Amino acid sequence: YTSAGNVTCWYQTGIVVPAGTPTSCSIMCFVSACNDFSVRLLKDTPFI
Amino acid sequence: RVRSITLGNSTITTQESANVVVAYGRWPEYLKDNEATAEDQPTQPDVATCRFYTLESVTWERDSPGWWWKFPDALKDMGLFGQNMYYHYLGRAGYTIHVQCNASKFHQGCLMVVCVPEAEMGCSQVDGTVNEHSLSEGETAKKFASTSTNGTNTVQSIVTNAGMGVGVGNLTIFPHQWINLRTNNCATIVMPYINNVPMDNMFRHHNFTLMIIPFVPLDYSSDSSTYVPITVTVAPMCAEYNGLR
Amino acid sequence: RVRSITLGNSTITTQESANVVVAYGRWPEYLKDNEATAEDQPTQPDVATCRFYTLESVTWERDSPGWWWKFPDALKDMGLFGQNMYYHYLGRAGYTIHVQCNASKFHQGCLMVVCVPEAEMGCSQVDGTVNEHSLSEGETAKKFASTSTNGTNTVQSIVTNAGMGVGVGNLTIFPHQWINLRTNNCATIVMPYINNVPMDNMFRHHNFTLMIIPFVPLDYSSDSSTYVPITVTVAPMCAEYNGLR
Amino acid sequence: EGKLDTMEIYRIPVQSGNHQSSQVFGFQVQPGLDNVFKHTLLGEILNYYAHWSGSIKL
Amino acid sequence: SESSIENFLCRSACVYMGEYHTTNTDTSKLFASWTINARRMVQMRRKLELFTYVRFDMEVTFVITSKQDQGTQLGQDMPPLTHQIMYIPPGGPIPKSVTDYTWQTSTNPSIFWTEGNAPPRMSIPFISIGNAYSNFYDGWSHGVYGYNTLNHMGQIYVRHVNGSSPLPMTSTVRMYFKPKHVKVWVPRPPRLCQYKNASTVNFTPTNITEKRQSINYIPETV
Amino acid sequence: SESSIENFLCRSACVYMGEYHTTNTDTSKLFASWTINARRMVQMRRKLELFTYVRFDMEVTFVITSKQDQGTQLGQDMPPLTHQIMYIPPGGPIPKSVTDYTWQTSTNPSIFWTEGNAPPRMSIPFISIGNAYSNFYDGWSHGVYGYNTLNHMGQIYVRHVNGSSPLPMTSTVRMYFKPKHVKVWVPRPPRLCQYKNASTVNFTPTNITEKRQSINYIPETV
């Protein structure tokens, strides 16, 4: 109900550690725009 | 020191320090033009056959004998490359296979990754015949066993004879790569099309077989993860079919 | 004075004395390269989209009001061109349409064959809305009526208003061809891709509509055949999709 | 739920043990409209304009 | 020369007339609004339907007249009245009261005007992420048949610019619309039936033309 | 092109609306006043906070409307009314009555205008002994946190220009403000919380964004 692309991530193997290291961990995502970005029709923002 | 590779609308990431085996020295290519000039005209898709297809990961535990896949028909449900298998009567293709592991410096183990042409397999009963389901299950892997198997119509899959009646320490004669958790975790194999005819039908013949076999089992200690994931990614190269017009 | 044409693994036969209408003077072609250079890369199948697809014939009898088809989705079950409609999110194409009759010199009648872009149709109830099934049935033709229709969600298909609210004698403003059983029995129309954007999704939009409408009804006498068959053949041209890699 | 006001909102959890075919995360790529992209630096700009288009880097 | 596209389409017309008050007990009668399309003016609609795709700029002029309500109170001495005319692009905030915050958003262009002067006027460019507008769409919105979202052109809203507790007044606005720098594609046959509503092509079946006496009849020559 | 700094900031807006009488028994209702800053307009404030330093000129237009009070007396015949609009630079005298001497000082620029004509307009340059204005100040005034005296921009005062013993009238002024020739330095993140008052950055803690169902949830595709 979007008509947009999507991204997903899957466990291929699983995480393997030696003795004496933390068990769980984390991933972080960063987003940005590439040089070819364009905008039109200045309007008012819906946040204030 | 990381490279990012895009094929079509797919993107994966590898390390630029990769090592690549080109199977017998031969890169894939089109059968050039004039083996069968007059009424044998081929066509090529080059649309969404050249793209990365990623299977489900497998789970490497302490007692894992190994895994195998058959090519093609591991890709008979994979989007367009699978559609072309039903629409066309003859075809051919080469492949690029990436195999990756996710492990830490506190794990240890060793894998052989080998691509075997014409891997004809034996039955568990000496005066028997193998079934079609026991040879492959498509995009799901079959499993080797650690002892000798029984039951009707099953491949005899004891891992020391690799289902072919040879010694498994001698499979290095084929295009192969080693994965030692100590020094690397990835392997790329580029396979060309190998047959005794130029084209063929892709449903009743298995061109080659991909096998993954642990030679030193996975070991870990106190509170590391108890498994390691392995991931396989395939990109078809220079695919070509019979013309329809 | 007969030509034989082969597209792919298809072959049909026409007469070299054919007449061809190129819709607005424009042949089909690829959107060249650089409308959307950076992250809009297309691909083209050119495999078994360029090939003749032949629908079922229709039967022209004494009281036949007419027939219409929607493009695309008259080809959503047609082999590879239909597979590509499901695998890809955007596409575009031009077409070549051949229409043929099989009749004798003892028959008589006259047909208009017209290709209409954006043929938006009206409902049988003025404060109603049209259904998706009543607009098309795929490779089966819808039928015009000779009187005004009723029922919910149906196109108002009286043939004099052509379902669009205009006078049917004025449809010659569109790319069209006449078939007069006295002088010819065939018609070729080459249609380019016409939209107000360069690509589009092929499932919820009907680019154009092919209509076939008798202006003088079929007549025969004593023991001639009581019907005449009409046959439609379509070849897609310069098809192009969004890249998947 | 339960962590819209902590630093934990930014961390994708990777768990321990053997789960080698399960999903880790997934989202639709819709800057400007979708909640996960809406308040970023790119999302905040796009919400000043009624039409926009380009490529995105993750 | 008079049949060129510009001379045929580029002509001004009144497309909306609305009324609004300074004080009321309905609060929707305190402002006037219009959605821009060319389907509720029957004479412009028909000339536009001869083509499938169109591209133009818009020019809008406003004629505004006021009146003191016949309620009761006389002897007033009032300065001239001020009005605000706001254009909202596609993808903009819509006001719901006359006291709303959206009457102050920096990206909604706005005109302030006081009576007695020349009539106000603004010029809008071709605003579409597509390459042309379409008069006909044989598709689904994503679901409404025949409606595509590339044809959005914006909205206009008008209010009074008083302070607190104003005096009662009633105003009328008339909007005059004109397309400019026009280009058209794919001609069509002319509409033969009467229009039934503003969003569909629905129609009741109509005769092809009117009758005469016989297929030979020609009227006597003078 | 529409994301350039000039097209993003250089836009007109109503920032102050005030009322004033000709006769009253309060004597502060006889004139209207406004201090120039850009912190009590919430939509302009947020767009300006994306930068740390700004430099611009100001343009101000005035829309003025009058009314006779509903008190009692009718049958009047009045000439059009005159108004005086005075700008005070930073470091100028401030009036306290409408009869004060400061309404005549030669260094306070002033505009005289009579109703019926075009709306009046004045243009103010960049007025600061510093090199830019600052939207954020992490300091003390010499003691108020966050307030530095280089941001003074002046004041505006409006009165009627009658003679002695005038007739009762009520006027409303609306001020439209526009920055021009703008330059900005050091971009900042956008304000995530609502504003609480006009002089501080005070706020109540806010959520980072809104929730969804799970970390895997993607909505079903149409």
Q: Give me the residue from D17, D21, D23 closest to A8, CB to CB.
A: D23
Please check whether residue C81 touches B, CB under 8 A. no
Torsion of CA B235, B238, B242, C2, to 10 degrees: 130
Q: Does A40 touch chain F (CB under 8 A)?
A: yes
Where does B126-170 show beta strands of DSSP type E? Answer: 142-143
CA–CA distances in Å: residue C72 to residues C139, C195, C200, E113: 10, 13, 12, 53
Contact F209 D23 (CB under 8 A): no
| Chains F+B touching (3+ CB pairs under 8 Å) | no
Output the six-digit token pair for F179: 């920055």
Residues contacting E2, CB < 8 A, separation 6+: E8
* Three-class secondary structure of residue E6 per DSSP: helix
Say if CB A6 and CB D28 are below 8 A apart. Answer: yes
What determination technique applies here?
cryo-EM
Neighbours of F40 (CB within 10 A): 15
Whether residue A7 contacts residue D22, with contact meaning beta carbons closer than 8 Å, is answered with: no
H-helix or E-strand spanning residue F121 = strand F121-124
How many angstroms separate the CA of residue A5 from the nearest CA in chain C?
10
Q: In Å, how far are C79, C120, C223, E138, E202 from C174, measured between CA atoms?
A: 30, 15, 38, 16, 21
Tokens of D43: 């999302």
D-chain residues within 8 Å CB-CB of C38?
55
Contacts with B38 (C-beta within 8 Å, 6 or more apart), sequence order? none
Instruction: Pick the closest to residue E156 from E17, E9, E10 (CA basis).
Output: E17
Contacts of D46 (CB under 8 A, 6+ apart): A39, D31, D32, D52
The residue of A3, A6, A39, A48 whose CB has the most chain F CBs within 10 angstroms, and thus the best one to mutate to test that interface, is: A48
- What is the interface size between C and E, counted as CB pairs within 8 Å? 96
Of E130, E197, E205, nearest to C148 by CB-CB distance is: E205
**In Å, what resolution does this model reach?**
2.6
CB contact under 8 A, A5 and D29: yes
Task: End-to-end CA distance of chain F: give it in Å, rounded.
Answer: 34
Residue of E nearest to D52 (CA): E129
Around Cβ E182, how many Cβ atoms within 10 Å? Answer: 17
Q: Which residues on E lie below 8 Å from A40 (Cβ)?
A: 127, 129
CB-based contacts of B194, cutoff 8 Å, min separation 6:
B23, B117, B207, B208
d(CA C187, CA F149): 85
Helix (H) or strand (E) holding F97: none
Could you tell me which of E153, E181, E177, E182 has the C-alpha nearest to residue E61? Answer: E177
Residue E199 structure tokens: 């969003």
Contact D20 B58 (CB under 8 A): yes
Label the pairing between strands B186-191 and B20-22: parallel
Residues of B in contact with D16 (CB under 8 A): 223, 225
Radius of gyration of chain E (CA): 22
DSSP-derived secondary structure letter, E118: P
CB-based contacts of F116: which residues, under 8 Å, 6+ apart?
Answer: E80, E116, F80
Among E173, E19, C49, smallest CA distance to B47 is for: C49
Determine the distance in angstroms separating the CA of B117 from the nearest CA of chain A, rounded to an integer: 26
Q: Indicate the residue of A15, A34, A41 with minimum beta-carbon distance to D49.
A: A41
D13 part of contact set with chain A, CB < 8 Å: yes
CA dist E189 → C161, E49, E53, E193 (Å)? 11, 8, 14, 12
Q: How many CB atoms lie within 10 A of CB B76?
A: 16
Contacts of D44 in chain F (CB under 8 A): 190
List chain B residues with CB under 8 Å of D18: 59, 61, 225-229
Nearest-Cα distance to chain E for A32, in Å, is 22
Residues B225, D21: C-beta atoms closer than 8 Å: no
Residue E105 burial (CB < 10 Å; 0-12/13-18/19+)? buried
**Residue E181 half-sphere exposure, CB side, CA atoms within 13 Å?**
9
In this structure, the number of other CB atoms found within 10 A of the CB of residue F165 comes to 6
Instruction: Assess contact for B25 and B190: CB atoms under 8 A.
Output: no
Of A41, A44, A46, the CB nearest to E106: A44
Ramachandran angles phi, psi of C112, nearest 5°: -100, 135
The H or E element containing residue F9 is: helix F5-9
* Residue B241 to residues B30, B44, B46, E7, F20, Cα–Cα distance (Å): 11, 6, 11, 58, 87
- Side by side, which strands form the sheet with F32-35? F32-35, F155-160, F82-88, F110-114
Q: What is the DSSP letter of E22?
A: S
Cα-based torsion angle of the residue sequence E12, E15, E17, E20 in order, rounded to the nearest 10 degrees: -100
Regarding chains D and E, contact by 3 or more CB pairs under 8 A is answered as yes
Pull the structure tokens for residue C182.
């006295």
Between CA C147 and CA C124 the distance in angstroms is: 12
Residue contact F67–E81, C-beta within 8 A: no
CB E102 within 8 A of CB E93: yes
Residue from B113, B227, B234 whose CB has the most chain A CBs within 10 Å, to mutate: B227
Please give the torsion angle defined by the CA atoms of residues F133, F139, F143 and F148, in that order, rounded to the nearest 10 degrees.
0
How many CA atoms are closer than 13 Å to the CA of E184, on its beta-carbon side? 19
Could you tell me where the beta strands, DSSP code E, fall in B158-207? 176-180, 186-191
Name residue B133's amino acid.
H
Do F193 and F200 meet the contact criterion of CB atoms below 8 Å apart? no
Residue F139 near residue F146, CB atoms below 8 Å: yes
Contact F221, A2 (CB under 8 A): yes
Contacting partners of chain F (3+ CB pairs under 8 A):
A, D, E
Query: What is chain D's length?
Result: 58
Question: What are the angstrom distances between the C-alpha of D32 and each of A41, A46, D45, E69?
Answer: 15, 11, 8, 47
Strand partners, B96: B190, B235
Residues of C in contact with B43 (CB under 8 A): 8, 46-48
Mutate to test the interface with E, among D45, D48, D51 (most CBs of E within 10 A): D51
Q: What is the CA radius of gyration of chain D?
A: 15
Mutation site for F-interface testing, chosen from D39, D41, D46, D49 by largest number of F Cβ within 10 Å = D39
Query: How many other CB atoms are there within 10 angstroms of residue E124's CB atom?
Result: 18
Nearest to B173 by CA among B101, B93, B119, B241: B119
Query: In 3-state terms, what secondary structure has residue E43?
Result: helix
Strand order in the sheet with E155-160: E32-35, E155-160, E82-88, E110-114
On the CB side of C94, CA atoms within 13 Å amount to 18
Preferred mutation among A43, A45, A47, A48 to probe E, highest tally of E CBs within 10 A: A43
User: Which pair of structure tokens corresponds to residue D42?
Assistant: 């790119």
- Exposure string for C134-158, b = 16+ CB within 10 A, e = fewer: bbbeebebbebeeeebeeeebbbbb
Three-state SS across E54-91? EEEEEEEEEEEEEECCCCCCCCCCCCCCEEEEEEECCC
Burial class (CB in 10 A: 0-12, 13-18, 19+), E209: exposed
Query: What are the residues whose beta carbons fall under 8 Å from the beta carbon of E96, sequence distance 6 or more?
Result: none
Q: Which two tokens stand for residue C118?
A: 């954006």
The residues near C161 (Cβ < 8 Å, ≥ 6 apart) are: C167, C168, E192, E193, E203, E205, E206
3-class SS string, chain C: CCEEEEECCEEEEECCCCCEEECCCCCCCCCCCCCCCCCCCEECCCCCCCCCEECCCEEECCCCCCEEEEECCCCCCCHHHHHHHHHCCCEEEEEEEEEEECCCCCCEEEEEEEEEECCCCCECCCCCCCCCCCCCECCECEECECCCCCCCCCECCECCCCCCCCCHHHHHHCCEEEEECCCCCEEEEEECCCCCCCCECCCCECCEEEEEEEEEEEECCCCCCCCEEEEEEEEEEEEEEECCC
Polymer length of chain A:
48
* Chain E residues with CB-CB distance to A39 below 8 A: none
User: Residue F141 — left, alpha, or beta (φ > 0 → left; ψ -120 to 50 → alpha)?
Assistant: alpha
Nearest to B23 by CA among B117, B88, B130, B102: B117
Measured between CA atoms, how close is A14 to chain D, in angstroms? 5
DSSP H or E segment with residue B105: none
CB–CB of B203/B22 below 8 Å? Answer: no
Residues of C in contact with E204 (CB under 8 A): 126
Q: Give the best residue of E145, E191, E195, E196 to mutate against chain C (max C CB count within 10 A).
A: E145
CA F220/CA A2 separation, integer angstroms: 8
Sign of CA dihedral C28, C30, C35, C40: positive
Hey, is the C-beta of A36 within 8 angstroms of any chain C C-beta?
Answer: yes
What are the residues whose beta carbons fall under 8 Å from the beta carbon of A10, sequence distance 6 or more?
B56, B57, D21, D22, D23, D24
In order of A24, B216, D13, D25, the CA distances from A27 in angstroms are: 11, 31, 7, 10
- Give how far Cα C79 sits from Cα of B60, B76, C18, C46, Å: 41, 17, 28, 13
Q: Quick check: B51 and B7 in contact, CB under 8 A?
A: yes
If you compute the radius of gyration of chain C from its CA atoms, what whole number of angstroms results? 19
How far apart are the C-alpha atoms of C151 and D29, rounded to whole Å? 43
Find tokens 């959107």 and name the residue.
Answer: C31
Query: Which chains, if any, share at least 3 CB pairs under 8 A with chain A?
Result: B, C, D, E, F
Indicate the helix (H) or strand (E) that contains E42: helix E42-48
Of B58, B59, B225, nearest to D16 by CB-CB distance is: B225
Nearest by CB to D18, from B56, B59, B223: name it: B59
Around B4, how many Cα atoms within 13 Å sit in the side-chain half-sphere? 6
Coil vs helix vs strand at E34: strand
> Are E177 and E124 spatial neighbours (Cβ–Cβ below 8 Å)?
no
D25 in reach of chain E (CB within 8 A): no
Residues in chain B closer than 8 A to C80 (CB atoms): 83-84, 87
Query: Cα(C177)–Cα(C196) distance, rounded to whole angstroms?
Result: 25
Asked if the Cβ–Cβ distance from E91 to A43 is below 8 Å, we say yes
Interface check B56 vs A, CB under 8 A:
yes
User: Is F43 in Cβ contact with E105 (below 8 Å)?
Assistant: yes
C-beta separation of C202 from C85 below 8 A: yes
Which residues of chain C lie closer than 8 angstroms to D55, CB-CB? 38-39
Structure tokens at F85: 């609009």
Give the position of tokens 């020391």. B160
> Which residue in F136, F155, F154, F156 sits closest to F146, CA to CA?
F136
Any C CB within 8 A of B90 CB? no
Residue corresponding to tokens 């498509």: B138
| Helix/strand/coil for D6 | coil
In sign, the C-alpha dihedral spanning E148, E153, E155, E156 is: negative
E and C interact (at least 3 Cβ pairs within 8 A): yes
| Cβ separation A43–E102 shorter than 8 A | no
Chain mean position to CA C50: 16
Q: Using CA atoms, how far apart are residues C203 and C82, in angstroms rounded to an integer?
A: 11
Query: CA separation (Å) from F3 to A40, A48, B106, B211, F7?
Result: 8, 20, 52, 56, 7
Best residue in E106, E117, E140, E160 for a mutation probing chain F (most F CBs within 10 Å): E106
- Alpha-carbon distance values, C243 to C236, F113, F222 (Å): 19, 66, 21
Which residue of chain E has the CA closest to D46? E91
The label of the residue with tokens 């400019």 reads: E180
